[PDB]
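quick one: calcium ion bound model?
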Amino acid sequence: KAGSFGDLQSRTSTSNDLYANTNLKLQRPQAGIVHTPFTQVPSGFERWK
Amino acid sequence: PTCGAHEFQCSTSSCIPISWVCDDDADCSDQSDESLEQCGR
Amino acid sequence: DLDTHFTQYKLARPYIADCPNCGHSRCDSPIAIEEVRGDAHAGVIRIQTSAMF
Ligand SMILES: [Ca+2]
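yep, here:
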């Protein structure tokens, strides 16, 4: 649910597969500078702790 | 005993990797790695 | 050896990238704070910049 407990689930500790929804969304760079700004909900594992 | 081929034993069965010798860090308890003989400084 | 930790770092260089609030008006600076990491247990953090130390 992107913010609760399972926003990053990996089948083992070194799996190449990785399921992760985090509500990532890209925003427009502004006023003539080069950067990539994004927006996502904070960590669900951190919120669980 | 002795440690593996990728580990350098300092003393008292405590070994460090090969790149971890003479690297300005006394990682070992006996500090045998930076001794004037192994390091020469 | 101390040289073993710098074999792949001799091939890299510093760079100038933008960062907000040098002084007042969002400079382009040799120091550019990217990816501050603060998940330790005594307030010790690791800061990645653009300069080479
Ligand atoms: Ca050492």
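Residues 13 and 19 of chain A are 13 Å apart (CA to CA).
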